[PDB]
Ligand binder design. Structure first.
Ligand SMILES: NC(=O)c1ccc[n+]([C@@H]2O[C@H](COP(=O)([O-])OP(=O)(O)OC[C@H]3O[C@@H](n4cnc5c(N)ncnc54)[C@H](OP(=O)(O)O)[C@@H]3O)[C@@H](O)[C@H]2O)c1
Ligand SMILES: O=C(O)COc1cc(Cl)ccc1C(=O)NCc1ccc(I)cc1F
Length: 316
């Protein structure tokens, strides 16, 4: 299987990338350096992760060392919810560019479909704990994203955590100039996303699977939640292939024509996670993994559920 997938902007995107949410700032520079040294060419970032400066130090060092050329890297970031307004989008993108020490992003995503009140706080709340919306909508935010392409700040634009109706709304936007290249969504054997993936793929939108290992380090994890890495059924498939459970969990979305972005700051795991191009899951393996779906989400948040554009009320 080829290492990159063709986007609807004409550029190629590496199907494996390194995730950076929760990567501590004192560890992520080494994580990204190691990743690039062992072959990663795609890094998934976001302003809200609070570690783009440190990710950028690694990228810049590897470019300066001539370990890789800029054209060989595929750097992704995301517009946070408190920057959905017309007059804030460019500055948000530029802050990310400055922190990453880049003059363009390969892909810039609307991180969530919901706009929040601008200000210092990433999750502005009212006194009862509900997020405070902005009156921005996904269509006007999209027009602002299109401007970034036309200004040379980003090579591609896309969306993240958009449900099928929200994707459809973007595709049906009056005067749409650039289609979204990517929809980045949670996807793993407990949340298989067949409906949303088929819709996006049918429209030429590439899907990126986040939390492919079930995000065991998510800060709201409960001791009782289901665990992909410990699931004996997945362990069995891994054993049959002489691979680790994580390697199976990474290969799974790859064979569905998805991009996948496992996170690690552990050098041995960063390397392990990249060794997924030399085996194949059978169709039966794939269908068996799909059968484990239970519609379980890592990524959901009660404080945001009443926002008009919160994505997870719809079935898909
Ligand atoms: N667009 C969005 O809204 C959104 C939401 C969630 C995630 N994402 C992106 O997707 C990325 C991945 O998702 P995620 O961070 O939620 O979780 P994940 O990649 O599913 O899991 C990360 C966890 O798995 C561990 N791990 C990694 N490789 C392992 C291995 N080979 N064996 C055992 N454990 C392993 C990591 O530990 P160590 O790091 O300690 O090694 C970490 O605790 C994020 O970092 C972010 O870039 C985007
Ligand atoms: O959103 C992400 O990329 C990962 O999740 C988070 C990352 C950070 Cl730095 C802070 C918070 C979250 C988090 O609560 N995500 C869940 C979530 C956020 C926003 C909305 I709108 C809905 C959600 F489910």
């Amino acid at each position: 299987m080829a290492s990159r997938i063709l986007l609807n902007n004409g550029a190629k995107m590496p199907i494996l990338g390194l995730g950076t949410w929760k990567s501590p700032p004192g560890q992520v520079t080494e994580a990204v350096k190691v990743a690039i040294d062992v072959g990663y060419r795609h890094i998934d970032c976001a302003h809200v992760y609070q570690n783009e400066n440190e990710v950028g130090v690694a990228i810049q060092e590897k470019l300066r060392e001539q370990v890789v050329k800029r054209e060989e890297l595929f750097i992704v970031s995301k517009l946070w919810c408190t920057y959905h307004e017309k007059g804030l989008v460019k500055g948000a993108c530029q802050k990310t560019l400055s922190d990453l020490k880049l003059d363009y992003l390969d892909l810039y995503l609307i991180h969530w479909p919901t706009g929040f009140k601008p200000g210092k706080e990433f999750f502005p709340l009212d006194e009862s704990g509900n997020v405070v919306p902005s009156d921005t909508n996904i269509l006007d935010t999209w027009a602002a994203m299109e401007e970034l392409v036309d200004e040379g700040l980003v090579k591609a634009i896309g969306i993240s955590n958009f449900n099928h109706l929200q994707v459809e709304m973007i595709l049906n936007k009056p005067g749409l100039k650039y289609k979204p290249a990517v929809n980045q969504i949670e996807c793993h054997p407990y949340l298989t996303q067949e409906k949303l993936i088929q819709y996006c793929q049918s429209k030429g939108i590439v899907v990126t699977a986040y939390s492919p290992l079930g995000s065991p380090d998510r800060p709201w994890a409960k001791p009782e939640d289901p665990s992909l890495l410990e699931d004996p059924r997945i362990k069995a498939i891994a054993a049959k292939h002489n691979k680790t459970t994580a390697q199976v969990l990474i290969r799974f979305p790859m064979q569905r024509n998805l991009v996948v972005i496992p996170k690690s700051v552990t050098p041995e795991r960063i390397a392990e996670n990249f060794k997924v191009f030399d085996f194949e899951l059978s169709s039966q393996d794939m269908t068996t993994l799909l059968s484990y779906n239970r519609n379980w989400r890592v990524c959901a948040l009660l404080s945001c559920t009443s926002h008009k554009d919160y994505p997870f009320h719809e079935e898909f």
